[PDB]
Design a protein around this ligand. Structure first.
Ligand code: CL
Ligand code: NA
Length: 353
């Protein structure tokens, strides 16, 4: 009758990782030049682990990307793994406008589909965003996958799942009137249950400073395994993020899984304050990306970088935790997790796996 869906956790096996090559000068006003190189570094690291699908506007852009990638991979050892797609984009925030892959189950059959949510540039802060909003459909077309549309605004960076029924989010973002004016909390949860197949929504509070997404959870807390959440915690009582992070840490310490058992909470440091043009930037180690063989963590040229990497290495002992300097990328108000979106690999023979 009615199908059910399943959203694999970020640590589940990937078929690939998607990226939207940067080109919007307005995203990094006055300092765009360093950005392309960061994406090349990211694409290179990802190509060591799995296929990398990159959205570009035209052949000229693809050439520019290939040149920068050649500096990272002079011999093209992993060149075959980087596949370009002529898919228009307005911004590079693939995490938020990108393909939200889910596994659909209906009448005993399972298939991979793209769950298309609406995108409105974090509450209408940027424009235009029609191409970003169309990315999921063009990806589905390119891969020949079915697409289901929800009609509700939702960014991938605003949610985080444990792959077993739990979904972590923030009231600051999902309940902000600038996203879904006509919807209330009950309706929003109903849609998350319906289209993502989750069972329990865990609502955290406010996000971090300098954040233009109105509190994305992916700049603060993330599931690392079925019952463990890593959360950034500021130790400087005078820092603006001290209070918000403290409230959410204490809240997490009272949250439980479906079994009613307390979730394991791992503390992560916050980067030392990052500024540009006299403005606080939303730098956070929680904005890391889990790939098949590596975990890519944004770093901000400070002694806390190695601390965050070591903690994440403990959380993912089977992977190589690698840092990528995001000192310039963060001027775009997002980092590694924000510019990526995994494509989970669905095994066709369910009885075998
Ligand atoms: Cl691991
Ligand atoms: Na969309």
């Amino acid at each position: 009758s009615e199908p059910t869906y399943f959203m694999p956790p970020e640590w589940a096996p990937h078929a690939s990782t998607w990226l939207s090559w940067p080109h919007k000068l307005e995203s990094w006003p006055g300092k765009f030049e360093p950005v392309p190189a960061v994406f090349a570094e990211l694409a290179y690291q990802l190509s060591r682990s799995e296929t990398v699908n990159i959205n570009v506007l035209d052949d000229a852009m693809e050439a520019q990307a290939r040149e920068l990638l050649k500096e990272r991979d002079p011999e093209g050892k992993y060149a075959e793994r980087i596949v370009f797609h002529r898919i228009p984009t307005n911004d590079a925030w693939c995490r938020d406008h990108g393909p939200n892959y889910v596994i659909r189950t209906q009448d005993g059959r399972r298939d991979k589909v793209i769950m298309n949510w609406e995108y409105n540039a974090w509450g209408g802060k940027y424009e235009p965003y029609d191409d970003d909003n169309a990315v999921p459909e063009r990806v589905a077309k390119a891969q020949g996958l079915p697409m289901v549309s929800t009609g509700m605004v939702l960014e991938g960076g605003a949610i985080d799942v444990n792959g077993a029924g739990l979904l972590l989010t923030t009231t600051a973002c999902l309940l902000n009137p600038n996203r879904n004016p006509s919807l209330g909390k009950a309706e929003i949860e109903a849609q998350l249950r319906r289209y993502l197949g989750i069972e329990k929504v865990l609502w955290l509070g406010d996000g971090i400073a300098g954040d233009d997404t109105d509190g994305h959870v992916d700049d603060m807390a993330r599931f690392v395994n079925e019952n463990t959440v890593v959360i950034a915690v500021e130790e400087d009582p005078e820092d603006e993020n001290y209070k918000p992070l403290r409230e959410n840490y204490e809240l997490l310490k009272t949250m439980t899984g479906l079994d009613g058992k307390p979730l394991n909470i791992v503390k992560l440091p916050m980067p030392e304050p990052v500024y540009y043009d006299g403005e606080r930037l939303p730098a956070s180690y929680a904005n890391f990306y889990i790939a098949n063989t590596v975990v890519l963590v944004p770093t901000y040229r400070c002694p806390r970088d190695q601390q965050a990497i070591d903690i994440l290495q403990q959380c993912f002992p089977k992977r190589e935790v690698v840092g990528i300097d995001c000192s310039d990328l963060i001027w775009g108000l997002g980092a590694i997790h924000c510019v990526t979106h995994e494509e989970p690999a669905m095994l066709e023979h369910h009885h075998h796996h």
